[PDB]
Structure 1
């Protein structure tokens, strides 16, 4: 299996672009940044709000917890290659405590509200806008030969006041090399694609599109998480009860994969459930027919049959967002 788009990005580009294990670690001055307070309590790295001592401009400080040196270089190299990109978090500097060499990544200041607190207050338009802004980030990183592999609400930071969206924490991101078999222990349980659950190791950028689909379903249907598995096996069972098992068997037969008999017994046999089943009076205002068609084209077992980020941006669901972006740049060119 090879990606439908951006397949040879890392074959075309030189070894220095994707060879993160040989990256030179040019540290900056840890004295230049002063900590203010904790923010995120993730166990891979701790997050703090800080300031540049000179410019006094705020910033985010992400202190990395002891992992393999190559994992640190992977995140830094990816952040460097994507730096500046649309809606990608901007890495400003990489410093370490001068005696213990404890590394810290310096980013632009976020000032966001977490997805869980904010989404219950969003209109259908705001959902389309933010999904569109997220797709801009996904198309960019995919075009640069990189898969995020940890798409989830916590990793999408939104400052609703300023309508700014940033895709953060590239700790699990990886370079796409055509035909390469990757580790399946990526993404958060609820957002893991079928490829991870059935051991299809030569997955691609399309994995992020499944995770985006899971987030989208959780938003428009107001059910967080949409696929609520208690473990990795149950996660596939939850998916099979919605998408159906006939489509799962066709997908397994297409890629010559077979499930362990214990897992196949758990999945059982189920019909495909239409997305209309999940609509209720409390989520109706967020579920338009275009929303359903868009979601249906993301949540497919076959990774090669899912929309690309570019194809997703072109969907009729975002016609209003694209028209508003075109009207904004016309009224801003006059003012």
Structure 2
């Protein structure tokens, strides 16, 4: 029916260039006319007003949260009826181009910055459900970090059942691949862990596999077949006989043979220990965001 927001005036904003094309939006850089302040304009097809209202609700809850995209205004085009979200502008230096240029220091700021966003969101009852490099705006010069694209985000109620067709391929946690419906905001910690692996090992996306059976197999190449079998037993999840047989052949290599001369310097012992904790198969045994932020890997950047 209507939007749950006091709508602004489309005339207050200018559009500069396209910077994004999502499944629900076209995204532009722009400005606020009276201020000159740079902003991002996210233009949505006026389709699924409930979903827009949910995204608006979520972003309003997260206002003034650290390193979270900030909703400055919502406007409706009076002639086309399209809706635009007006967001803060964050520079997006693509981490895939910065392999061997991002230091240990940059990676700790990057991961810690996103953890701050997740702690605030989780504390306010929201899980993002699509953490990945593509939704993390990283400024290699300023070190600014922003977690964006809350369209898949959901409000979290314990022992509630949720749709497992979330996240992006190769960031889906075992709880989504195995269809555990009562998954938790710890999904966001697995996804950030997969991001950390990609940065440490110079490979984004880090995990692979053509289908979900092969994706489970490839996780266990590192993490061990037994942990996956034990997980599937503990939560009553279904694995085909063939996959169980394959999983029992995998001792789990962890992070061995992933450290060569080009990434040796960023693969510190503290980083691996955080990665191992974050990529824990049992979604109920991963660190919370708050716990991960207390890891010694963040000791040297904690000051600021």
Does the alignment reach a TM-score above 0.5? yes
Match of 1:193 in 2: 173
Q: Deviations over 1:268-311 (max 9, x none)?
A: 63112132332112110011111111111111110111111111
> CA 1:116 to 1:44, structure 2 compared with 1: closer, same or farther past 3 Å?
farther
- Alignment of 1:256 onto 2:236: yes
Distance 1:147 1:255 in 2: 21
- Alignment of 1:274 onto 2:258: no
* Superposition pairs of residues 301-320 of structure 1, within 5 angstroms: 301-320=281-300
Distance 2:122 2:103 in 1: 29
Match of 2:67 in 1: 87
Superposed displacement of residue 231, structure 1:
3.0
Match of 2:161 in 1: 181
* Superposition pairs of residues 205-284 of structure 1, within 5 angstroms: 205-261=185-241, 263-264=243-244, 267=247, 269-284=249-264
RMSD over aligned CA atoms reads 1.8
Distance 2:99 2:66 in 1: 22
Which of these residues, 119, 129, 136, is aligned with residue 156 of structure 1? 136
Which of these residues, 22, 39, 49, is aligned with residue 59 of structure 1? 39
Match of 2:103 in 1: 123
Q: Which runs of 4+ in 1 moved over 6 A?
A: none
Match of 1:114 in 2: 94
Structure ranking higher in helix proportion: 1
Question: In 2, are the aligned partners of 1:245 and 1:272 still within 8 Å (CA)?
Answer: yes
Which of these residues, 283, 294, 315, is aligned with residue 274 of structure 2? 294
Q: Deviations over 1:174-214 (max 9, x none)?
A: 00011110000101111100000001010111000000110
Match of 2:123 in 1: 143
Distance 2:235 2:2 in 1: 34
Distance 1:120 1:65 in 2: 40
Question: In 2, are the aligned partners of 1:115 and 1:157 still within 8 Å (CA)?
Answer: no
Match of 1:71 in 2: 51
Structure 2 residue matching 1:61: 3-state secondary structure: strand
Question: In 2, are the aligned partners of 1:189 and 1:235 still within 8 Å (CA)?
Answer: no
Structure 1 length-normalised TM: 0.86
Structure 2 residue matching 1:60: 3-state secondary structure: strand
Give unpaired runs (5+ residues) of structure 1.
1-20, 326-335
Which of these residues, 67, 82, 89, is aligned with residue 102 of structure 1? 82
Structure 2 length-normalised TM: 0.94
Which of these residues, 40, 45, 49, is aligned with residue 29 of structure 2? 49
Distance 1:139 1:119 in 2: 27
Structure 2 residue matching 1:210: 3-state secondary structure: helix
Moved more, 280-289 or 268-277: 268-277
Q: Deviations over 1:97-156 (max 9, x none)?
A: 113321110011223322222344111111112211111111111111000000010100
Structure 1 residue matching 2:290: 3-state secondary structure: helix
